[PDB]
Design a protein around this ligand. Structure first.
Ligand SMILES: CCCCCCCCCCC1=C(C)C(=O)C(OC)=C(OC)C1=O
Ligand code: SF4
Ligand code: SF4
Ligand code: SF4
Ligand code: SF4
Ligand code: FES
Ligand SMILES: [Ca+2]
Lengths: 905, 145, 589
């Protein structure tokens, strides 16, 4: 479409309103209530522009650009006198009751309201009367509430209810006494409530975790990184100050995680700032714990490694691609073992084979919001891959979107779309061991053991395509529900099947693959999505290796007298007693880790590795996208005795000292090129980010804003002589503001969003080709594999029906967004959010055992008689015990296992 | 809109009352005698219109109480210079199309009609000089002319 | 219509003459807020355009400025030719009282411009500076070497990819090898300058006058080739006082750069502050009220009297009389008492703001102004009758280092020298800024010869006229605001900031991120204490300056130095150095 802004002709998209069309062209219109993801509601009345219908028109009409379509032949004026005075008056009306709170506000310097007050040019106060006040609510450990700063723009409630699907946030009150919050005090139990601190243009909802150790946005040193708390791989902007990770901001990736994170990835970063982390190489001599620098650690480690007959390496899915590859190239191809168990590795390799060999296109996370009918098999998505559950909610509301689009209603008229699509929504069928958080929008929820979920998946695949193997023994009511699912999936245009390795069963993934194959055989645009466990599970599966049990028996039989463990606690994937015995029997345990794990008591040498905030690397997410994360800060700038290096740097220098007796600190691009040379399946990680020689017109990319303060005083307590800024030889970024962060720079890795006049997270508008669309000059990260020309065959191994055996109890996994991650649970702020360890029981099984809700029963697994209190679960099937995976003492490897001697004690 | 005695010889149609700068409305007219102070009447009207706002959109929600407080100041004789101009700007910026619904244009129609026809009653409530600030000891204030 | 509006400048007759000479498709006209016609011309026609401007009926006889600009990072270049680098030439015609700014666009690989030294001899140091800081080569230049950086310097510092801060590079480690290498670099090599270090009869004497000399007014060195006592040739070596203030202008916000403007000419103070804040107000679109103009005129005339007192005492000291410097610095202490009362600081006040001044005048400033105005003229008459009417001082001064109007125009000489040549060109009258039209004062001019004595007596008359201006402004000071009511006035008034939320928001975003001045080019030229000081500010629409070009008169005077003292003795050079009114922060910036 063609519009005329201030006499200048512009070519815009006619399906967009005037606000996003003009913001895409670089025209600054003030706005509060409009968001690119939420839609247009016309509340704040800030986006006023003067519209003319003809080229020869003098009077015009003040309209809302967010509510006015960008049709062909509209002549709008933004900087007309009447429009500017009205926008200034709207800012003034918002300023009548706003508190004098900017110095004591966490949103100061990051405030959209401040930016829009300055942009309209209102700086004189003529209001002389009183300002209304509000009491504040306790919203939990994550979100701090300050209701006086609200401008009643309704972004919070629109996001929290119409987007995130939350139920405990709302609008209350009246004429000018509007309150935004909960009906009482309590924690916001939505898994995406952390996005309120960036959705809210004011300082009402603030990051309490950042408010504990608060610094302003200009004082933050930012980097582009990837969230390491699960497999989705959302792009984040970690920002630090004074040597500690202060905040995790959302980093816009129009392909993956555009505007929203989950609460685990936004508030689970506190393990980086733990004081028990290793900061030097520490060597154990008997009972003494001596501290070495890097060179003596390398020389001693290489001496003992040369004095051994075989060295094995146990990687981890928590480590990056480069560190696992450096371990593999240090110990050899045959001596490298993945740190996961045999069953976890089998499920992971099956999921990878389905993804890159099944012939079915695995969608990106933004593309999940366009699929019609969603079938989740086995996965508890909202607790393991929560952002995928958010995109599933969007795909479910796609039915109301298409129904309103059938009535010539614009895409951005979100209120009219929700009015037309009252409760009609796209079909969602979730299967789990219990009730999920998607059950409010699910067309059906199947509460059954994983064998029965797999059998239901195989029955769906057989009913969709008769060539699929049949399962006999299905009840007629279950058959009716199955044919309902089949009629919903067959009538869909873009069906989506979501499974994963967290269900603890191979047949669930096989059934999901068979359903996807049957949907593809009918000529449908089927997509499949596997949810892995850790951040780099897919990279570890692609690189491959032996299981943890093979490494454990290699250490136990004595063939391996030297074990190098890379960022693994080894109690998460195997029993603690067997691991402890194997590591105590081995005469050399050398652990490269950045968190104080339990196997460091037996470790003969500990290498203080760097976490994601202090290391560069590559991670492969659940859809096979190689994403590069960059270092945020140098740990040794403030604390001079800190010897903390990248794990791939540790292992590369260790291998160099092993071979040539010389210590060699490599570069990130050298290790990347080594991965591309040795592993052809990981060849796409070279193009994930450009190398360290990349420049924007000769200068590097700045990690901190141009108004970074305290340079000559932040280190003056140590020494009055300011040292050189740390040099980044690994990446194209610099640990200084002497660099480039323009919105029009030809790059894909943006550390943070700032524009002149745009200090809020609304500054991401300047960094996109169109607002709410893709990032300018493409999104970061590339896909490792394409969709294959041919697919797999039908998995004929249909499992038998789950029969509850007497005495033995099948362990049903219960994943928690706060608690089931290895590193997020070490954050001190997650202690007040993690649920108490409760074993879930059927009413019938608890009545048989004589247990009621609340009391404690004891169960023994591998000689560990541990006692948990009982919570009654109605939806759990009989014969199973519900256990929380990832908690203290309950490994995720316990899923699907047996449980003997379950007695009340 | 308020109308005067000269508007009494006017037929009660939509276009006839609309041409004379008012609205037919519900055709249920209300008479204001000479004993009724018009500033108090408009204050009562704006108090009703501000307290019956829904709070969805900014101009009505955060500008009707401003007019209410200005009229409370004018009722008590504590009006300050610029208050009537602020009321006129509020009437101009709360008209049709500026707000989300039509509650606020109908709210501000009696105010502009009363200012147009009975300005001398609104000017009589301005007694004290304009003062938005207070003296901060140690800082010389900027004396704009 | 306000004077800060973006004017296309197609009504200037010079534009019409250029159209009728070179055709209508030979150049582009850039609409700026400089107040000067900006003409983008091709590189091939640069010398022809310069010759045409030099051969006009009322010609552009002076090269005011010549410098480069890195346009690789400039996002808003609508209506401009495509360029990675650019070179601008600011020229003045005194007869028309007009300026022009010619801009030449250069690609990143083809960074060569024809030399401008044949048309204007003062282009030599400007082209050396442009090569040193931007890497732009000038073809046909006689000796293109580094003038601000030492010869063993890698990279060009004013390029956008060069790091601005010292903390980016390694800390300064002075070793024996580095000391020896930099001492060999600092050693004068006469074969490079063609000095011809010998004669058949006798040998020439190569003497370093400076950095450590009482006659040198800073850290710079003149290398003198001598026979006996006579000077054969001089090489004034500058760059020893380089603080990187333009790169610092690219590094600070608009508000936070004001103290750095204060240290450009450290005897100037508010006189250094005025052109920068006026150019920023042109960028913002701020028209300051009358009281702001009168206060700024007050402080700049006070600091002009301060600088002239120091200059006269310094000249008398270098002539040989060591007494009047004590009394002149006592008068400087009286001015410092008034300035400490008003601004709170002695010598670098940093008191001017965008849209006004930092505070209002304190209660009782007129008492100290009256005290100084009563104390001054008797002391000045005593200085005159004691030292300036001394026949030994006249013998050391009159006829020493004399040049006419042609040498003053070809070398860009401004200030007291240009008026001492008889050319009545003062910025406060020709292009009146800050409301100088409301003050009755005279402009002293010379008889046609710019002696040391003539320049000193002209500065004495300028001091007397500044006393007259101070008396007029003391007797008539307006009662209004000390800050403008513009939203971009940085910072806003303090009490409204302390008790209003709009003012608090504006203050919060103006002192932290900086005021957002929209993308435009601005220029302000003022009459400094030592000549003409100009600020040329290119804004990219951000909160920091994209380009800050500072033109100073002491640069031109020090470049004029070899052409006016060649063939004289060293004593004439000492008197010439004392009678130029230069500081070296002014030169090297
Ligand atoms: C000791 C008796 C009083 C001395 C007063 C000297 C006043 C300033 C003299 C001029 C001067 C200035 C400004 C100056 O900056 C300088 O360079 C460092 C000189 O050389 C040492 C000077 O001579
Ligand atoms: S929400 Fe924004 S405008 Fe309000 S007090 Fe906080 S920083 Fe200031
Ligand atoms: S709390 Fe924040 S997001 Fe919600 S209406 Fe108020 S200003 Fe808007
Ligand atoms: S969904 Fe996973 S990758 Fe994304 S923010 Fe949450 S924990 Fe991090
Ligand atoms: S004008 Fe209407 S929509 Fe707006 S706040 Fe008032 S009553 Fe609500
Ligand atoms: S952005 Fe259009 S009314 Fe709020
Ligand atoms: Ca690094």
């Amino acid at each position: 479409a063609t519009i005329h802004v201030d006499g200048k002709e512009y070519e815009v998209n006619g399906a967009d309103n005037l606000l996003e069309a003009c913001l895409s062209l670089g025209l600054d219109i003030p706005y509060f209530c409009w968001h690119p993801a939420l839609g247009s509601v016309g509340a704040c009345r800030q986006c006023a522009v003067k519209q003319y219908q003809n080229a020869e028109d003098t009077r015009g009409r003040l309209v809302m650009s967010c509510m006015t379509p960008a049709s062909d032949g509209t002549f709008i004026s933004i900087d007309d006198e009447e429009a500017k005075q009205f926008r200034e008056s709207v800012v003034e009306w918002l300023m009548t009751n706003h508190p004098h709170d900017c110095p004591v506000c966490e949103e100061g310097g990051n405030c959209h309201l401040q930016d829009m007050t300055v942009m309209t040019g209102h700086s004189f106060r003529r209001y002389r009367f009183t300002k209304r006040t509000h009491r504040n609510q306790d919203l939990g450990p994550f979100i701090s509430h300050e209701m006086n700063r609200c401008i009643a723009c309704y972004r919070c409630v629109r996001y929290y209810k119409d987007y995130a699907g939350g139920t405990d946030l709302g609008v209350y009150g009246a004429h000018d006494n509007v309150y935004f919050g909960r009906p009482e005090d309590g924690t916001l139990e939505s898994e995406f409530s952390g996005n309120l601190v960036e959705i809210c243009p004011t300082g009402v909802f603030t990051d309490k975790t950042h408010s504990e150790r608060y610094n302003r946005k200009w004082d933050m040193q930012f980097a582009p990184s990837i969230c390491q708390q699960c497999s989705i791989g959302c792009n984040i902007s970690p920002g630090e100050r004074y040597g500690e990770l202060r905040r995790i901001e959302n980093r816009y990736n129009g392909t993956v995680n555009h505007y929203f994170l989950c609460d685990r990835g936004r508030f689970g970063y506190g393990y980086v700032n733990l004081k028990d982390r290793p900061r030097q190489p520490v060597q154990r001599r008997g009972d003494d714990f001596i501290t070495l620098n890097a060179e003596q650690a390398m020389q001693g480690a290489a001496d003992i490694l040369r004095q051994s007959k075989k060295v094995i390496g146990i990687g981890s899915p928590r480590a990056s691609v480069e560190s696992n590859f450096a371990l593999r190239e240090l110990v050899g191809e045959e001596n490298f073992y993945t740190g996961i168990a045999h069953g976890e590795q089998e499920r992971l390799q099956l999921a990878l084979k389905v993804l890159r060999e099944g012939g079915i296109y695995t969608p990106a996370l933004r593309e999940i919001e366009s699929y019609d009918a969603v079938l989740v098999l086995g996965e508890d998505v909202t607790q393991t891959g929560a952002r995928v559950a958010l995109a599933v909610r969007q795909a479910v509301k796609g039915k109301a979107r298409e129904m309103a689009a059938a009535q010539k209603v614009a895409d951005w008229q979100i209120a009219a779309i929700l009015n037309i699509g009252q409760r009609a929504k796209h079909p969602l069928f979730v299967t789990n061991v219990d009730d999920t958080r998607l059950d409010d929008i699910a067309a059906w929820t199947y509460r059954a053991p994983v064998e029965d979920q797999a059998r239901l998946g195989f029955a769906i695949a057989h009913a969709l395509d008769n060539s699929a193997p049949a399962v006999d023994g299905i009840e007629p009511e279950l058959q009716s529900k199955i044919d309902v699912i089949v009629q919903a999936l067959a009538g869909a245009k873009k069906p989506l099947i979501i499974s994963g390795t967290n269900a603890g069963s191979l047949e669930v993934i096989q059934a999901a693959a068979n359903v996807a194959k049957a949907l593809k055989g009918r000529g449908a645009d089927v997509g499949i999505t596997m949810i892995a466990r850790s951040v780099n599970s897919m990279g570890l599966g692609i690189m491959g290796g032996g299981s943890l049990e093979e490494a454990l028996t290699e250490l136990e039989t004595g063939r391996a007298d030297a074990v190098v463990v890379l960022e693994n606690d080894l109690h998460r994937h195997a029993s603690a007693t067997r691991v402890n015995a194997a590591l105590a029997k081995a005469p050399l345990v050398m652990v490269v880790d950045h968190q104080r794990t339990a196997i460091m008591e037996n470790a003969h040498l500990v290498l203080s590795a760097a976490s994601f905030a202090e290391s560069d690397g590559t991670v492969i997410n659940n859809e096979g996208r190689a994403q590069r994360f960059f270092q945020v800060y140098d740990p040794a700038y403030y604390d001079s005795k800190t010897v903390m290096l990248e794990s791939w740097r540790w292992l590369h220098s260790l291998h160099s000292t092993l071979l040539s007796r010389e210590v060699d600190w490599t570069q990130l691009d050298h290790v990347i090129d080594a991965v591309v040379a040795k592993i052809p399946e990981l060849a796409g990680i070279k193009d994930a980010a450009p190398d360290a020689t990349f420049r924007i017109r000769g200068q590097k990319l700045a990690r901190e804003p141009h108004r970074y303060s305290g340079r000559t005083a932040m280190r003056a307590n140590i020494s009055v002589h300011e040292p050189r800024q740390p040099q980044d030889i690994d990446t194209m970024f610099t640990f200084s503001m002497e660099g480039n962060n323009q919105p029009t720079a030809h790059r894909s890795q943006v550390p943070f969003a700032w524009a002149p006049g745009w200090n809020s997270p609304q500054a991401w508008n300047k960094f996109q080709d169109e607002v709410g669309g893709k990032l300018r000059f493409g999104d970061p990260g590339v896909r490792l594999f394409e969709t294959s020309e041919n697919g797999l065959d039908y998995f004929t191994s249909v499992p038998a029906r789950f029969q509850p055996q007497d005495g033995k109890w099948r362990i049903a996994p219960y994943y928690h967004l706060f608690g089931s991650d290895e590193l997020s649970q070490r954050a001190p702020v997650f202690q007040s959010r993690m649920p108490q360890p409760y074993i879930k029981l059927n009413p019938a099984d608890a009545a048989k055992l004589g247990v009621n809700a609340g009391t404690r029963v004891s169960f023994s697994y591998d000689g560990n008689t541990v006692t948990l209190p009982v919570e009654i679960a109605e939806g759990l099937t009989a014969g199973q015990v519900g256990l929380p995976m990832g908690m203290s003492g309950i490994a995720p490897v316990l899923a699907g296992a047996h449980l003997e001697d379950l007695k009340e004690a | 809109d308020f109308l005067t005695e000269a508007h009494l010889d006017l037929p009660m149609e939509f276009e006839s009352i609309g041409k004379a700068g008012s609205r037919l409305g519900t055709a249920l007219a209300m008479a204001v005698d000479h004993e009724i102070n018009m500033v108090s009447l408009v204050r009562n009207l704006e108090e009703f219109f501000a307290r019956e706002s829904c709070g969805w959109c900014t101009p009505c929600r955060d500008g009707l109480p401003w007019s209410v407080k200005i009229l409370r100041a004018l009722e008590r004789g504590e009006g300050q210079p610029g208050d009537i101009e602020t009321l006129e700007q509020l009437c101009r910026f709360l008209g049709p199309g500026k707000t989300f619904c039509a509650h606020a244009p109908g709210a501000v129609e009696p105010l502009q009609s009363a200012i147009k026809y009975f300005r001398e009653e609104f000017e009589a409530g301005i007694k004290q000089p304009f003062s938005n600030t207070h003296l901060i000891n140690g800082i010389q204030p900027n004396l704009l002319k | 219509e306000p004077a800060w509006q973006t004017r296309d400048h197609l009504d200037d007759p010079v534009i019409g003459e250029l159209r009728n000479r070179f055709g209508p498709d030979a150049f582009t006209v850039q609409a700026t807020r400089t107040g000067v016609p900006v003409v983008w011309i091709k590189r091939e026609q640069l010398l022809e355009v310069g010759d045409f401007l030099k051969k006009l009926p009322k010609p552009y006889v002076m090269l005011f400025d010549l410098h480069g600009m890195d346009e690789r990072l400039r996002t808003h270049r609508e209506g401009l030719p495509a360029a990675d680098f650019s070179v601008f030439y600011h020229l003045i015609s005194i007869d028309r009282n007009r300026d022009i700014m010619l801009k030449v666009a250069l690609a990143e690989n083809d960074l060569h411009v024809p030399t401008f030294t044949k048309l204007f001899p003062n282009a030599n140091w400007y082209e050396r500076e442009t090569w040193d800081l931007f890497g732009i080569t000038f073809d046909g230049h006689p000796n293109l070497r580094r003038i601000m950086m030492p010869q063993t310097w890698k990279g060009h510092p004013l390029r956008k990819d060069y790091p601005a801060r010292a903390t980016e590079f390694s800390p300064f480690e002075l070793t024996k090898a580095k000391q020896d290498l930099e001492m060999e670099a600092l050693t004068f090599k006469p074969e490079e300058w063609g000095m011809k270090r010998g004669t058949e009869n006798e040998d020439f004497m190569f003497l370093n006058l400076g950095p450590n000399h009482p006659s040198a007014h800073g850290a710079f060195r003149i290398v003198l080739q001598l026979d006996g006592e006579e000077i054969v040739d001089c090489v004034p070596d500058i760059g020893y006082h380089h603080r990187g203030a333009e790169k610092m202008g690219e590094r600070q916000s608009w508000h936070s750069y004001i103290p750095y403007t204060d240290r450009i000419e450290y005897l100037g103070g508010c006189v250094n502050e005025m052109p920068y804040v006026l150019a920023v107000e042109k960028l913002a679109g701020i028209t300051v009220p009358d009281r702001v103009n009168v206060i700024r005129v007050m402080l700049s005339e006070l600091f002009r009297i301060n600088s002239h007192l120091l200059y006269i005492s310094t000249f008398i000291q270098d002539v040989g009389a060591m007494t009047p410097v004590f009394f002149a610095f006592t008068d400087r202490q009286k001015i410092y008492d008034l300035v400490e009362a008003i601004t709170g600081f002695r010598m670098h006040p940093a008191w001017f703001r965008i849209g006004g001044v930092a505070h209002d005048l304190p209660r009782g400033w007129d008492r100290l102004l009256r005290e100084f105005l009563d104390w001054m003229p008797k002391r000045l008459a005593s200085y005159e009758k004691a030292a300036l009417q001394n026949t030994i001082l006249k013998g050391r001064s009159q006829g020493v280092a004399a040049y006419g109007a042609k040498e003053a125009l070809e070398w860009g000489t401004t200030g007291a020298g240009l008026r001492a040549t008889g050319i009545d060109f003062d910025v406060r009258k020709a292009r009146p800024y800050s409301g100088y039209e409301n003050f009755d004062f005279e402009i002293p001019v010379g008889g046609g010869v710019s002696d040391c004595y003539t320049r000193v007596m002209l500065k004495v008359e300028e001091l007397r006229q500044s006393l007259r201006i101070l008396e007029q402004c003391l007797n008539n000071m307006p009662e209004g605001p000390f800050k403008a009511d513009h939203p971009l006035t940085t910072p806003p008034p303090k009490e409204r900031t302390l008790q209003h939320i709009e003012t608090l928001i504006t203050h919060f975003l103006q002192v932290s991120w900086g005021p957002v001045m929209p993308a435009n080019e601005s220029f302000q030229m003022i009459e400094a204490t030592k000549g003409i000081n100009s600020y040329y500010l290119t804004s990219d629409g951000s909160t920091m300056s994209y380009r800050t070009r500072i033109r100073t008169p002491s640069y031109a005077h020090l470049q004029q130095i070899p052409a006016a003292i060649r063939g004289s003795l060293v004593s004439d050079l000492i008197v010439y150095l004392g009678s130029i009114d230069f500081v070296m922060s002014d030169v090297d910036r």
